[PDB]
Amino acid sequence: DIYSKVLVTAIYLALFVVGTVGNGVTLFTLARKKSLQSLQSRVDYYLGSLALSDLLILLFALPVELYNFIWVHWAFGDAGCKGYYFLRDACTYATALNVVSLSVELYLAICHPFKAKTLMSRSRTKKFISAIWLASALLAIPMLFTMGLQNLVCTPIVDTATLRVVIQLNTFMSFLFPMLVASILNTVAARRLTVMVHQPGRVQALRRGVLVLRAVVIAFVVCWLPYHVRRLMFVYISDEQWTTALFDFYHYFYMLSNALFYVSSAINPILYNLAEDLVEDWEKARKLLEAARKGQDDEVRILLANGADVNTADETGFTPLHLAAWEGHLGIVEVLLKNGADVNANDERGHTPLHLAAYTGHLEIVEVLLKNGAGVNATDVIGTAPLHLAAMWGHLEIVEVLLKNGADVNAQDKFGKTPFDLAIDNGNEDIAEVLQKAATRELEVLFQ
Numbered sequence: 297d298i299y300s301k302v303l304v305t306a307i308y309l310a311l312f313v314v315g316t317v318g319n320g321v322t323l324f325t326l327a328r329k330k331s332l333q334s335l336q337s338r339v340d341y342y343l344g345s346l347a348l349s350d351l352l353i354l355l356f357a358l359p360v361e362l363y364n365f366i367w368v369h370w371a372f373g374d375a376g377c378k379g380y381y382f383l384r385d386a387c388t389y390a391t392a393l394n395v396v397s398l399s400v401e402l403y404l405a406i407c408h409p410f411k412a413k414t415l416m417s418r419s420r421t422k423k424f425i426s427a428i429w430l431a432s433a434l435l436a437i438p439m440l441f442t443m444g445l446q447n448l449v450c451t452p453i454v455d456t457a458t459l460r461v462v463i464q465l466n467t468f469m470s471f472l473f474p475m476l477v478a479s480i481l482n483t484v485a486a487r488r489l490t491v492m493v494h495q496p497g498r499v500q501a502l503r504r505g506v507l508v509l510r511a512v513v514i515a516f517v518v519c520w521l522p523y524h525v526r527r528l529m530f531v532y533i534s535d536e537q538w539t540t541a542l543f544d545f546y547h548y549f550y551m552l553s554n555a556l557f558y559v560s561s562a563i564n565p566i567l568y569n570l571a572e573d574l575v576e577d578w579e580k581a582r583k584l585l586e587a588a589r590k591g592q593d594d595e596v597r598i599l600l601a602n603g604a605d606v607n608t609a610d611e612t613g614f615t616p617l618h619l620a621a622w623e624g625h626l627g628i629v630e631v632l633l634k635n636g637a638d639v640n641a642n643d644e645r646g647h648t649p650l651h652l653a654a655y656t657g658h659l660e661i662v663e664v665l666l667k668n669g670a671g672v673n674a675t676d677v678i679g680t681a682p683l684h685l686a687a688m689w690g691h692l693e694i695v696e697v698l699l700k701n702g703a704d705v706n707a708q709d710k711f712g713k714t715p716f717d718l719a720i721d722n723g724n725e726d727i728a729e730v731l732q733k734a735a736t737r738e739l740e741v742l743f744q
């Protein structure tokens with residue numbers, strides 16, 4: 297139908313530009329990045345080799361299928377008819393062999409790190425990626441002789457029996473065999489790394505390579521499995537003609553698998569980067585929360601430089617600033633604020649860093665917070681404000697600073713207690729006297 301033609305055409309154009317940009321940016325990045333780790337540079341060479349095959353499908357295969365299949369009712373020549381299937385077949389091999397070769401290098405590095413250290417270099421990996429690309433072209437040569445131009449339409453130039461044989465072998469050799477090998481090696485590599493880790497940043501690269509691979513495998517398996525199942529349906533089909541429902545099913549499934557093929561190649565960079573960056577982000581986030589609390593000045597400085605989230609909140613809603621303000625680390629509080637730390641950050645109860653700074657009696661930090669635009673009158677779910685906690689725990693110095701920055705003396709909590717009530721009940725006579733004076737500010741100012 298026309299609705300289906302418009303739907304699919306839009307998806308192809310979306311996949312094309314996003315895939316071309318994504319894989320295009322990837323190649324530029326990985327080509328022009330200087331990784332300070334031998335193993336991680338080799339992982340990049342494989343992702344660069346995958347980005348190349350991803351781009352060839354999107355620039356040479358997608359437009360032909362878009363044009364000479366769905367969009368319009370053949371005009372790419374015999375070279376194009378043969379070239380299309382050859383190039384598409386070649387890329388799928390190059391992908392499957394890149395994923396296997398990568399999974400092999402990771403497996404050896406984890407299970408045999410001693411041998412892998414001496415018997416693996418960037419030059420050796422560059423040698424195999426060539427071999428992968430050269431072997432891919434070698435295995436894809438049969439497709440040049442199975443499809444040809446006749447009448448002008450691009451149709452098979454061999455009997456269905458012979459065509460069934462090459463397609464069957466292709467699906468097994470190009471997908472089923474390698475993907476399973478990659479999957480097993482990846483699964484085993486991940487398990488033995490856990491044991492290997494338990495016993496400078498080689499483990500991070502090995503952890504990154506496993507995550508990257510795992511996601512890249514799942515993406516291409518999920519996306520090409522329907523496409524290859526379809527090709528096995530072709531070779532193992534029953535008699536001519538079936539129920540209209542069955543014809544509708546195979547037609548939709550054919551049209552679907554066609555589209556799903558280009559999904560994998562398009563959003564692969566985004567998917568493996570997202571997954572890898574999520575773990576690295578979460579890691580650096582939790583490292584910052586502990587470094588900020590423990591009082592590690594150097595650790596916090598490095599982690600913020602490495603691009604850790606300064607405003608990251610924990611399960612209880614605490615940011616690095618909350619704990620740094622609580623534990624009384626003035627050096628870190630300033631460093632955090634300089635890096636754009638949210639000074640009015642809330643938690644589960646709705647406490648700000650100023651609530652915690654006042655409670656623990658950190659005068660110097662209380663000022664630096666306020667100086668950087670901290671809410672002096674900020675209240676929690678109970679209705680407690682910094683002035684309540686400062687007066688409560690007998691911190692006269694802070695009470696003066698808070699009042700000096702316009703702290704509400706009449707502010708009450710759920711229990712109907714003012715900062716004065718807390719000061720009096722806690723036997724803080726010194727604080728309570730200043731609070732009663734502050735309350736009579738309006739009276740004295742005008743009259744006197």
Ligand SMILES: COc1cccc(OC)c1-c1cc(C(=O)N[C@]2(C(=O)O)[C@@H]3C[C@H]4C[C@H](C[C@@H]2C4)C3)nn1-c1ccnc2cc(Cl)ccc12
Nearest residue numbers: 452459463526527529530531533543544546547548549550
């Ligand atoms: C008997 O084949 C199937 C049975 C059930 C479901 C099917 O597709 C989901 C298929 C199927 C697969 C292919 C299938 O994979 N074409 C090719 C491809 O690359 O896609 C074409 C055509 C040949 C040479 C070459 C490589 C193969 C096989 C290009 N084509 N194809 C179909 C063949 C015949 N009639 C069909 C009718 C319907 Cl409604 C749907 C699919 C049909």
